[PDB]
Write a protein that binds this ligand. Structure first.
Ligand SMILES: CCCSc1c(F)c(F)c(S(=O)(=O)NC)c(F)c1F
Ligand code: NA
Ligand code: NA
Ligand SMILES: [Zn+2]
Length: 258
């Protein structure tokens, strides 16, 4: 009876195994764009993905992860609200059963069809597993997806999904360029928060881009043909793998833009 996204083991249950679910800096949150504080001293975000090395794509039973070689400073995030250098380890998405829901963060209570999370760890701490135990261990770049025109830089990911349909499947995934998933503007909101799946550790500086990317209905339909179950177990479509907005508590969301 492990955690997942249903009536009996979904987000409202997670606090029984992970009590930090009711903690003081949990994610996601609703971003109130009118009450976000413009901070004219926030720097532009530096996304340096030219040398990125993807390796593999994996269905972990919760989402699919595109994994990168993070054994050298090859794909890094810095600047923005960050001190120090954070290495890209993987990205994944959260999405809905319908185009009207799927994102974890919301903007003035608006839900997007999906949300991309590019996960990075602070080189300070030497690897991802040590970094998640630190309050400034991770920087997650969050990008909303709306349904409209196709994102051509997403199609290599969508086309491989049929090979990792079920939990525990993986496939080689080299030479994928994550710059193809970025919108034109790097204007962002930022706040201190947490992982949005168990263990829900409060180790994340969240950086949420204001501009969504558009993907087609066909692209997101393909995400919804994945499965949460293993091969030869009964079919449960991988849809609605998002945690809803959590209380902001004693936090201020800062904006890089007016
Ligand atoms: C061993 C490498 C896995 S790194 C990972 C992940 F797989 C994940 F799902 C989330 S999330 O809580 O689901 N989105 C915030 C993360 F934050 C992560 F950092
Ligand atoms: Na190279
Ligand atoms: Na690692
Ligand atoms: Zn995520």
């Amino acid at each position: 009876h492990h955690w997942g996204y249903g009536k009996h083991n979904g987000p409202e249950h997670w606090h029984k195994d992970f009590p930090i679910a009711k903690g003081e800096r949990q994610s996601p949150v609703d971003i109130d764009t009118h009450t976000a504080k413009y901070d004219p001293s926030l720097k532009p975000l530096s996304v340096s993905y030219d040398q990125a090395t993807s390796l593999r794509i994996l269905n972990n039973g919760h989402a699919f992860n595109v994994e990168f070689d993070d054994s050298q400073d090859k794909a890094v995030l810095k600047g923005g609200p960050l001190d120090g250098t954070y290495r890209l380890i993987q990205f994944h998405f959260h999405w809905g059963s319908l185009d009207g829901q799927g994102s974890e963060h919301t903007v003035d209570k608006k839900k997007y069809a999906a949300e991309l999370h590019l996960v990075h760890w602070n080189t300070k701490y030497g690897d991802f597993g040590k970094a998640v135990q630190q309050p400034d261990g991770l920087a997650v770049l969050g990008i909303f997806l709306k349904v409209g025109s196709a994102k051509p830089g997403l199609q290599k990911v969508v086309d491989v999904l049929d090979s990792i349909k079920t939990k525990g499947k993986s496939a080689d995934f080299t030479n994928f360029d994550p710059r193809g998933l970025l919108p034109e503007s790097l204007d962002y909101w930022t706040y201190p928060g947490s992982l949005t799946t168990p263990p829900l550790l409060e180790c994340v500086t969240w950086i949420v881009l204001k501009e969504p990317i558009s993907v087609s209905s066909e692209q997101v339909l393909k995400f919804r043909k994945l499965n949460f179950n293993g091969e030869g177990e009964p079919e449960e479509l991988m849809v609605d793998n998002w945690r809803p907005a959590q209380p902001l508590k004693n936090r201020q969301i800062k904006a890089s833009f007016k």
